[PDB]
Amino acid sequence: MRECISIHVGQAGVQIGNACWELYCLEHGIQPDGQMPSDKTIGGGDDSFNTFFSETGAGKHVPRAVFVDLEPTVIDEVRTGTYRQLFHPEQLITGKEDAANNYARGHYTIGKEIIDLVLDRIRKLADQCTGLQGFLVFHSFGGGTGSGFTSLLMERLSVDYGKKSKLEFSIYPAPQVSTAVVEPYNSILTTHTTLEHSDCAFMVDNEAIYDICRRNLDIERPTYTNLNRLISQIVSSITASLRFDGALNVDLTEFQTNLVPYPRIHFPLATYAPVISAEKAYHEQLSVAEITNACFEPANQMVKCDPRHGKYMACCLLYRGDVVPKDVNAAIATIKTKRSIQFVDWCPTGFKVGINYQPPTVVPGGDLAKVQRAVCMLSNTTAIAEAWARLDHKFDLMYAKRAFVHWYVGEGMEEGEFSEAREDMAALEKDYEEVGVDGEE
Amino acid sequence: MREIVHIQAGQCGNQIGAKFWEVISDEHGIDPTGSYHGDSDLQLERINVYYNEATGNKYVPRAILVDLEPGTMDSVRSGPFGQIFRPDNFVFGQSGAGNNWAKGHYTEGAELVDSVLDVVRKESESCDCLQGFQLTHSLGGGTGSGMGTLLISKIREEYPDRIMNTFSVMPSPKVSDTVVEPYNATLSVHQLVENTDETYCIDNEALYDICFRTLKLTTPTYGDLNHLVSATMSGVTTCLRFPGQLNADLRKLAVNMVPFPRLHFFMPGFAPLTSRQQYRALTVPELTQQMFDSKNMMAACDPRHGRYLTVAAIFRGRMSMKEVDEQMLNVQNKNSSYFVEWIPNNVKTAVCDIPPRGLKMSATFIGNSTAIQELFKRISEQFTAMFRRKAFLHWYTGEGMDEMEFTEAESNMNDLVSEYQQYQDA
Amino acid sequence: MEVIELNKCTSGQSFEVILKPPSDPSLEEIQKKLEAAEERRKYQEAELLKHLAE
Amino acid sequence: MYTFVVRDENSSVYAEVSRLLLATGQWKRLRKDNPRFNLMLGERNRLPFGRLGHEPGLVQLVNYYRGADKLCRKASLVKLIKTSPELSESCTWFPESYVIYPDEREVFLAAYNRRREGGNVWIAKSGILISSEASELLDFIDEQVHVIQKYLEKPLLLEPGHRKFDIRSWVLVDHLYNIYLYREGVLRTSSEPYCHLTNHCIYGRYEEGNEMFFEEFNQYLMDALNTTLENSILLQIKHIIRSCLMCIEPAISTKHLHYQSFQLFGFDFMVDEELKVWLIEVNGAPACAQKLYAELCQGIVDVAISSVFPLATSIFIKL
Numbered sequence A: 001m002r003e004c005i006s007i008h009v010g011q012a013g014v015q016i017g018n019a020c021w022e023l024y025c026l027e028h029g030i031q032p033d034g035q036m037p038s039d040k041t042i043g044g045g046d047d048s049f050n051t052f053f054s055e056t057g058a059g060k061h062v063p064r065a066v067f068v069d070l071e072p073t074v075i076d077e078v079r080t081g082t083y084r085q086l087f088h089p090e091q092l093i094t095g096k097e098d099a100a101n102n103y104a105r106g107h108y109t110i111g112k113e114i115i116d117l118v119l120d121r122i123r124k125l126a127d128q129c130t131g132l133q134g135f136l137v138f139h140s141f142g143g144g145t146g147s148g149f150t151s152l153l154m155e156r157l158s159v160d161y162g163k164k165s166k167l168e169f170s171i172y173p174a175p176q177v178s179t180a181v182v183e184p185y186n187s188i189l190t191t192h193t194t195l196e197h198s199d200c201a202f203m204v205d206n207e208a209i210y211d212i213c214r215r216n217l218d219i220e221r222p223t224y225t226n227l228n229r230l231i232s233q234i235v236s237s238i239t240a241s242l243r244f245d246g247a248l249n250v251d252l253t254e255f256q257t258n259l260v261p262y263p264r265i266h267f268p269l270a271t272y273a274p275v276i277s278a279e280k281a282y283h284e285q286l287s288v289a290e291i292t293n294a295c296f297e298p299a300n301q302m303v304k305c306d307p308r309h310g311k312y313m314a315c316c317l318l319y320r321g322d323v324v325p326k327d328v329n330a331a332i333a334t335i336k337t338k339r340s341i342q343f344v345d346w347c348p349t350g351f352k353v354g355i356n357y358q359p360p361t362v363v364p365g366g367d368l369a370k371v372q373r374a375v376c377m378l379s380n381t382t383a384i385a386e387a388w389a390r391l392d393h394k395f396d397l398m399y400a401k402r403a404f405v406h407w408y409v410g411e412g413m414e415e416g417e418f419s420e421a422r423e424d425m426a427a428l429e430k431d432y433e434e435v436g437v438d439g440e441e
Numbered sequence B: 001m002r003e004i005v006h007i008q009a010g011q012c013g014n015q016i017g018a019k020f021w022e023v024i025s026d027e028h029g030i031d032p033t034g035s036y037h038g039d040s041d042l043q044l045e046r047i048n049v050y051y052n053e054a055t056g057n058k059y060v061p062r063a064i065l066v067d068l069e070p071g072t073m074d075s076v077r078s079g080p081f082g083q084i085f086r087p088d089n090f091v092f093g094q095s096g097a098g099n100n101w102a103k104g105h106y107t108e109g110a111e112l113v114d115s116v117l118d119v120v121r122k123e124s125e126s127c128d129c130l131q132g133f134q135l136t137h138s139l140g141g142g143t144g145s146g147m148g149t150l151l152i153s154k155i156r157e158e159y160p161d162r163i164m165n166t167f168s169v170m171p172s173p174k175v176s177d178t179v180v181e182p183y184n185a186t187l188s189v190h191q192l193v194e195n196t197d198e199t200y201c202i203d204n205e206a207l208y209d210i211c212f213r214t215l216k217l218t219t220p221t222y223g224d225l226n227h228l229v230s231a232t233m234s235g236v237t238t239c240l241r242f243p244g245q246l247n248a249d250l251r252k253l254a255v256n257m258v259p260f261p262r263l264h265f266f267m268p269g270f271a272p273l274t275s276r277q278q279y280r281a282l283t284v285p286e287l288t289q290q291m292f293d294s295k296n297m298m299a300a301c302d303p304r305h306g307r308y309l310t311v312a313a314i315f316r317g318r319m320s321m322k323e324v325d326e327q328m329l330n331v332q333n334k335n336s337s338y339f340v341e342w343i344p345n346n347v348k349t350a351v352c353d354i355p356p357r358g359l360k361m362s363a364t365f366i367g368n369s370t371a372i373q374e375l376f377k378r379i380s381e382q383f384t385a386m387f388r389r390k391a392f393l394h395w396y397t398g399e400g401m402d403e404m405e406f407t408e409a410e411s412n413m414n415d416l417v418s419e420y421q422q423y424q425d426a
Numbered sequence C: 001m002e003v004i005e006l007n008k009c010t011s012g013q014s015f016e017v018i019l020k021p022p023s024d025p026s027l028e029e030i031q032k033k034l035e036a037a038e039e040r041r042k043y044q045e046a047e048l049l050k051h052l053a054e
Numbered sequence D: 001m002y003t004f005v006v007r008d009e010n011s012s013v014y015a016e017v018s019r020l021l022l023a024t025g026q027w028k029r030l031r032k033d034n035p036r037f038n039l040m041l042g043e044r045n046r047l048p049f050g051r052l053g054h055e056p057g058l059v060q061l062v063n064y065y066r067g068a069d070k071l072c073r074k075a076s077l078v079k080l081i082k083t084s085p086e087l088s089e090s091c092t093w094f095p096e097s098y099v100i101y102p103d104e105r106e107v108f109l110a111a112y113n114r115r116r117e118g119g120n121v122w123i124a125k126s127g128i129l130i131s132s133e134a135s136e137l138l139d140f141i142d143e144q145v146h147v148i149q150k151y152l153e154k155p156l157l158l159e160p161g162h163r164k165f166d167i168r169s170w171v172l173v174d175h176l177y178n179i180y181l182y183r184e185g186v187l188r189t190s191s192e193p194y195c196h197l198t199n200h201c202i203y204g205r206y207e208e209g210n211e212m213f214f215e216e217f218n219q220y221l222m223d224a225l226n227t228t229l230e231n232s233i234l235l236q237i238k239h240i241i242r243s244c245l246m247c248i249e250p251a252i253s254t255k256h257l258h259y260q261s262f263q264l265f266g267f268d269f270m271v272d273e274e275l276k277v278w279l280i281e282v283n284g285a286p287a288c289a290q291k292l293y294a295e296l297c298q299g300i301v302d303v304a305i306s307s308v309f310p311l312a313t314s315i316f317i318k319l
């Protein structure tokens, strides 16, 4: 067994982490008071779920998690929420004034004063691990803390935990639920600084989650609660291999080996199906072929983009529920004849498949219906570069006028960091183009 | 706990400030004696932002009342909610300022400014995490204009990393007390360009025209004008006073609204505004269209003469959030010419469930438009018409000012006008 | 099409299907950057207080 | 009101479409870089498809199908036909072609020699050269990827004049992937006796501007060959159009996409003396005949634009 430490940064990271750990407890049979009647090894053990939960002598199963935010109101809800008894105060770190949607304020001004405390608390969790494999970092791109403090933390984690793997769950900004005009600035700044320190990052575009909630769950105006319960289902699907017995993606290094052939191109596209409303009394249950086919529908992707116009470098299918390998192969054969699935010439054209027999758990009173089988596809396709192009274009529009730049320079940052970050993104877009691209008439 | 310290200075500042505290006290369930008697926990969730909690679960406004003559503050103390203010927070002199910026800024005001800073310091020391200050004042008089901007400069010196926000009433010859108002306003505007982060430009010409043309008030009084301002001030501070995601504090508001440091002068607006029909229900399309109409804006500038850099819209009451989005994106897509293309997604929308006292639905508009240059152009024209002949300057040189300070103030505001024109063509 | 690496347990199983073959900055460096930004903040504040003193 | 942007000032077809939209009183033209549009008349090269369909509250439509270039570039069209099982290398309506880079150079020679051993004139294009023996064709290409195609040595020759020609068909594919064939085609006829190239760029003897329209051409087929345009030719044309567009439909369809596409195509056909129709090439940004501009562009607005954006007998044949 090798432990995994989760780090939740800023409002988006904290609220999504709250949703994930609630779901983990339901999946593993852990009550809100931390007790787990199935763990017959009281006070310890090296089971698969111990990668995410430590154990006290009184039988409490404690998440290996740190929550950090620069203002206290979001983490205060963790202290008073349903799963308050799960965490001890040292896992919850708050400041008094946030980064004001300003990367420079989160990375320099405020980050420099709290980074040592955050590292001390993480070190306390790491000291409790017999073989720590790495970190899972949850944060927004757009917030000042999620962007600015995360990039600072990732740099220091590389220094202090050089051999550890680092995975991200990153919230890509969408104007339909966005809170700041400068979110394109913060996104590019944090991606540039974090790029060399992250081994694999799962981007989740709020626009995609919003539309899935509207279309599939019939929610006219989704809230963060609606979005986070959907996001936590996808996160749970991705991390399930670390928390349950299995052979695929059983350590963080396997995510990189299986999904990331080049270090910089480390942003897999997640696609999840089926998403079905709780309100309807009877849904028709989608077969293995139908949910597998749905993995190639852009409407089910965590980032809206067209994989038909890119190339694949790796593809994993993560099933939960009533699924047998025979039906997966039959589904894949049918899909390959009818779909535009082209791999790069230097990579094998295949799927790595994992099946977990337990069906996906849903939160009682939630919006997702309980389904008989579900699947999350993780593909590394050049098509996700469309998301970078969209962000870089919004960056260019504002920066050409130096709009809002004075807020960042005012916090000690230099204008050179903007262009240096943007040039790194331009090279990243160029990297995706190289890997994946072949009037009056 | 992100506390705001409120300051109201001079006649106009204290009269509008008193009405603002009456309005938001009713919204938060605070009676004139400071006791809470509402029926919703949302009224108390962020009440710390504007109120201190004293002994006996009583709520005292974090407000400081400043004037160089006692008259207006005597009438505030004898007013409806006059007993809710902390008695030690009344700071006043006796000589008055004579509608003279120099008296407020350099002579009479300088004698009193240290006593105000003592009360500011006392309120700031009792703040868990002070976020900044909001000042209410006029620019056309002496105390609010001259001493108000002196206070802003000294506060910035002592709290350089805090946000400074003002509600500044701009003078107009149509609603004028004295001919020297363009002088006082031009000197004040330069101070605001340097020392505030956000300034709501409230034009008395617009308030009068709204009262006369829209509200059908044949003879508007200053009380009628201040009724519009207090409703507007409650709207633009809703995001600070109630739980919300957007522009929830002064600094996040500034980062969203101010793309260049000197261009921080906002045009506010409010809807509904109608003659006394009054019980008629208002729909989301009607709120949105009214809120964006020039007739509902309080800076007497035509937004179709310029372009929006940023816009914040706040809807209050129970309404369809989906419908709010459709009409907000409707007006945005249909009139895309008036929004700058180089700031993507520059219109932000918030919704608060608690509506004002007498309405089921309302909307407040905050625009950073390059058309505000028309306001500064009008003041510059009125300034120059007198300064060309050095008219009425003896009132100021008698207080020790030199003509060079007027020349520099004139150049500074013309520079501000030129800066707006740069981005209007961009 | 071929199935390889079939591993089975009581909670699930996994395998691979192949359809076609192919054809850091140190702590002191970070510290210098954080301190350089902090000095630029102090210089800007020093200029402001000098401007206000004038 | 609906909003649109113009990104290709050189398109005569869409310069007309834009002025028809600016005559309904319900369409407004924005600056070309305003992202808040309903309709993009995009640029011909490097259209930023990845930035479409991300504007909240806006249904966005663009006049180009991402990925249709596979059909509209000569080298990729040859590769598409030979590698798509729906079309097969046994495709009967496409002349024998080979993609060779200055590779299918060796397979071209084996086919070339086997018929010179047993007429074999070929053509080069990507700038045209027609030669009878293969050694000369290859030396011209090393002077960009080209294709060598079997030259139709027995074309259908119009009389009087003994003159070559080709047929241009305009095809509109809407957002639902309905395939609309404009009822009016044009014959770009050579004015010299068989003169090998019929491009309108390359006069006015038998018909104005070397353009014969379907009414006259059908009248000719009845008088000289005792058949009709519909029977002898148009049935094969409709078959080829459907075969090509249905083949790429899974790759380019925008049915479940966050934005929608339509596109106007120019199909070029040749007819041999046995009244067999051969596909020459597909053009993704075609112009129109001067007479047919008003009718076709109005049809574009009716079928492709107003269908998605409703305003306040069809000229197309639905395939």
Ligand SMILES: C=C(CC(=O)OC)C(=O)N[C@@H](c1ccccc1)[C@@H](O)C(=O)O[C@H]1C[C@@]2(O)[C@@H](OC(=O)c3ccccc3)[C@@H]3[C@]4(OC(C)=O)CO[C@@H]4C[C@H](O)[C@@]3(C)C(=O)[C@H](O)C(=C1C)C2(C)C
Binding pocket: B022, B023, B026, B211, B215, B224, B225, B227, B228, B230, B231, B232, B234, B235, B272, B273, B274, B275, B276, B277, B278, B279, B356, B357, B358, B359, B362
């Ligand atoms: C505490 C007070 C002062 C007060 O009034 O107490 C003595 C207060 O104003 N609070 C309110 C508030 C609003 C926004 C944000 C925060 C608070 C609100 O909750 C309320 O009570 O509005 C008051 C305001 C009205 O006077 C009136 O306006 C005026 O004639 C008037 C004259 C001069 C200047 C301004 C207005 C008012 C208008 O103005 C408004 C504001 O709605 C105008 O067009 C708006 C439409 C309203 O339908 C219409 C027409 C009314 O007819 C209505 O019957 C009524 C209400 C709902 C009053 C007649 C009593």
Ligand SMILES: Nc1nc2c(ncn2[C@@H]2O[C@H](COP(=O)(O)OP(=O)(O)OP(=O)(O)O)[C@@H](O)[C@H]2O)c(=O)[nH]1
Binding pocket: A009, A010, A011, A012, A013, A015, A016, A069, A070, A098, A099, A100, A101, A102, A106, A140, A141, A142, A143, A144, A145, A146, A147, A171, A172, A173, A174, A177, A178, A179, A180, A183, A206, A224, A227, A228, A231
């Ligand atoms: N999916 C999802 N997105 C969120 C959530 N909370 C915030 N966001 C997104 O995150 C971005 C704003 O960043 P935040 O995380 O709220 O800000 P922060 O990290 O706390 O940083 P500061 O508040 O500036 O100190 C916006 O794009 C929001 O849409 C959430 O709970 N779920």
Ligand SMILES: Nc1ncnc2c1ncn2[C@@H]1O[C@H](COP(=O)(O)OP(=O)(O)CP(=O)(O)O)[C@@H](O)[C@H]1O
Binding pocket: A441, D095, D123, D125, D149, D150, D151, D152, D153, D164, D165, D166, D196, D197, D198, D199, D268, D270, D280, D281, D283
């Ligand atoms: N295999 C072949 N056999 C006979 N003629 C051919 C041929 N390939 C091309 N041509 C001749 O070439 C002319 C057009 O060539 P092509 O269409 O490749 O050039 P082009 O694409 O620049 C003109 P356009 O854009 O209008 O289609 C036709 O008039 C046709 O007669």
Ligand SMILES: Nc1nc2c(ncn2[C@@H]2O[C@H](COP(=O)(O)OP(=O)(O)O)[C@@H](O)[C@H]2O)c(=O)[nH]1
Binding pocket: B009, B010, B011, B012, B013, B015, B016, B097, B098, B099, B100, B138, B139, B140, B141, B142, B143, B144, B145, B169, B170, B171, B172, B175, B176, B177, B181, B204, B207, B222, B223, B225, B226
């Ligand atoms: N809206 C409004 N404007 C006022 C009020 N009182 C004065 N003014 C305006 O304020 C300016 C005069 O300044 P005033 O506040 O009276 O002088 P001060 O006491 O020295 O600050 C003129 O432009 C007046 O039109 C008021 O109650 N409401």
Ligand SMILES: [Ca+2]
Binding pocket: A039, A040, A041, A042, A044, A045, A046, A047, A050, A055
């Ligand atoms: Ca155990």
Ligand SMILES: [Mg+2]
Binding pocket: A010, A011, A071, A098, A143, A145
């Ligand atoms: Mg935050």
Ligand SMILES: [Mg+2]
Binding pocket: A441, D281, D283
């Ligand atoms: Mg061509």
Ligand SMILES: [Mg+2]
Binding pocket: B011, B012, B141, B177
């Ligand atoms: Mg007065």
